[PDB]
Scaffold this active site. Structure first.
Site, mmCIF file in Angstrom:
data_model
loop_
_atom_site.group_PDB
_atom_site.id
_atom_site.type_symbol
_atom_site.label_atom_id
_atom_site.label_comp_id
_atom_site.label_asym_id
_atom_site.label_seq_id
_atom_site.Cartn_x
_atom_site.Cartn_y
_atom_site.Cartn_z
ATOM 1 C CE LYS A 45 -2.225 2.558 3.408
ATOM 2 N NZ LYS A 45 -3.563 2.844 3.872
ATOM 3 C CE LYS A 85 4.732 0.403 -2.592
ATOM 4 N NZ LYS A 85 3.811 0.930 -1.611
ATOM 5 C CE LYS A 101 6.813 9.325 -4.171
ATOM 6 N NZ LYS A 101 5.726 8.458 -3.782
ATOM 7 C CG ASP A 159 -1.499 -0.559 -3.482
ATOM 8 O OD1 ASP A 159 -1.300 0.489 -2.884
ATOM 9 O OD2 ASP A 159 -1.845 -1.599 -2.915
HETATM 10 N N1 ATP Z 1 10.863 0.763 9.726
HETATM 11 C C1 ATP Z 1 10.680 2.082 9.658
HETATM 12 N N2 ATP Z 1 10.997 2.861 10.736
HETATM 13 C C2 ATP Z 1 10.806 4.197 10.650
HETATM 14 N N3 ATP Z 1 10.316 4.900 9.623
HETATM 15 C C3 ATP Z 1 10.012 4.094 8.575
HETATM 16 C C4 ATP Z 1 10.153 2.716 8.519
HETATM 17 N N4 ATP Z 1 9.737 2.224 7.286
HETATM 18 C C5 ATP Z 1 9.356 3.286 6.636
HETATM 19 N N5 ATP Z 1 9.501 4.458 7.362
HETATM 20 C C6 ATP Z 1 9.177 5.830 6.984
HETATM 21 O O1 ATP Z 1 7.813 5.900 6.619
HETATM 22 C C7 ATP Z 1 7.663 6.445 5.272
HETATM 23 C C8 ATP Z 1 7.260 5.339 4.305
HETATM 24 O O2 ATP Z 1 8.359 4.890 3.498
HETATM 25 P P1 ATP Z 1 8.225 4.953 1.921
HETATM 26 O O3 ATP Z 1 7.890 6.339 1.483
HETATM 27 O O4 ATP Z 1 9.501 4.460 1.341
HETATM 28 O O5 ATP Z 1 6.982 3.944 1.622
HETATM 29 P P2 ATP Z 1 6.396 3.593 0.179
HETATM 30 O O6 ATP Z 1 5.291 2.598 0.361
HETATM 31 O O7 ATP Z 1 7.426 3.063 -0.745
HETATM 32 O O8 ATP Z 1 5.730 4.996 -0.348
HETATM 33 P P3 ATP Z 1 4.857 5.141 -1.752
HETATM 34 O O9 ATP Z 1 3.412 4.717 -1.596
HETATM 35 O O10 ATP Z 1 4.883 6.632 -2.031
HETATM 36 O O11 ATP Z 1 5.517 4.443 -2.918
HETATM 37 C C9 ATP Z 1 8.994 7.174 5.017
HETATM 38 O O12 ATP Z 1 8.923 8.545 5.442
HETATM 39 C C10 ATP Z 1 9.986 6.335 5.803
HETATM 40 O O13 ATP Z 1 11.112 7.062 6.271
HETATM 41 MG MG MG Z 2 7.877 4.289 -2.577
#
Ligand code: ATP
Ligand code: MG
Ligand code: FES
Ligand code: FES
Length: 271
Positions: free
Chosen positions: A10, A15, A41, A128
């Protein structure tokens, strides 16, 4: 040989931080990896490349206005632990949809010969859906393994179950499977029992519980992974145990998703 894995889950659950920190831990122990970012992005390779953002294939094919005229060294840059990084991107200043952007990216990589002999893993940081455009990171000569990052909330679990529906309904019987559920923490010691209970219901495992730790934010304002910025942190050892667990994983399943009646029961049992 080249194991091709792909990270789904999600929005905002973690991720790209889990992918980059897992890949950094893999590079640290010796594995040879390529990350291919499949998000409009460009943010799948920043902590590995210490870049502001990587220059996408879809901003070097509309910039240079090509059909077949672009070089691989202009989009495949090496970073921490020698990890190779490619960024697909969207038609992000242009017009359209991403999805297809991934198709005109791993086709480019194939044609330019990026999938070399001593590559151990290729991680795609998709989104997703295991559908069409975003599923050619899963096609016949592509990824065999999918790991879903989820958490204790209703919408993260619902996303895991629907991605899992897209995996059983992967086109024809080739071989794209589910390797496990990476739970990225948010609560305490009841949340891990929720993801394990969903996993057992889907026929997978919770391959690792990743803690929520502020070193993650400290490392990434400094544009790095926790393995690079702070090797001795307990969180660094968390991504090294996730990395060991993915490296030894032999439970690629064809998942058995639950109905929304059942997910609500599981969630009701907890929060
Ligand atoms: N284990 C963790 N401990 C602390 N902060 C975390 C952890 N995992 C993720 N985060 C933080 O929470 C946020 C989520 O990470 P990220 O943006 O990479 O997720 P994503 O699912 O890839 O986002 P998107 O939907 O935009 O692709 C970031 O700000 C990251 O620093
Ligand atoms: Mg991401
Ligand atoms: S263009 Fe999906
Ligand atoms: S386009 Fe799903």
């Amino acid at each position: 040989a080249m194991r091709q894995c792909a990270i789904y889950g999600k929005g905002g659950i973690g991720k790209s931080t889990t992918t980059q920190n897992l890949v950094a831990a893999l590079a640290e122990m010796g594995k040879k990896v390529m990350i291919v970012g499949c998000d409009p992005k460009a943010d799948s390779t920043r902590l590995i490349l210490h870049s502001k953002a990587q220059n996408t294939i879809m901003e070097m094919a509309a910039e240079a206005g090509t059909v077949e005229d672009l070089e691989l060294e202009d989009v495949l840059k090496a970073g921490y632990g020698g990890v190779k990084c490619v960024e697909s991107g969207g038609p992000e200043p242009g017009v359209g949809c991403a999805g297809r952007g991934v198709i005109t990216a791993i086709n480019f990589l194939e044609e330019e010969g990026a999938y070399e002999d001593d590559l151990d893993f290729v991680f795609y940081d998709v989104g997703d859906v295991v559908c069409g455009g975003f599923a050619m990171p899963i096609r016949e000569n592509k990824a065999q393994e999918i790991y879903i990052v989820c958490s204790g909330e209703m919408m993260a679990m619902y996303a895991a179950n629907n991605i899992s529906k897209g995996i059983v309904k992967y086109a024809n019987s080739g071989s794209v499977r589910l390797g496990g559920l990476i739970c990225n923490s948010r609560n305490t010691d009841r949340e891990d029992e929720l993801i394990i209970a969903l996993a057992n219901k889907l026929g997978t495992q919770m391959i690792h519980f990743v803690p929520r730790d502020n070193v993650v934010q400290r490392a990434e304002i400094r544009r790095m992974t926790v393995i690079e910025y702070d090797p001795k942190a307990k969180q660094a050892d968390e991504y090294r145990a996730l990395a060991r667990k993915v490296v030894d994983n032999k439970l690629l399943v064809i998942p058995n998703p639950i109905t929304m009646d059942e997910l609500e029961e599981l969630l009701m049992e907890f929060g």
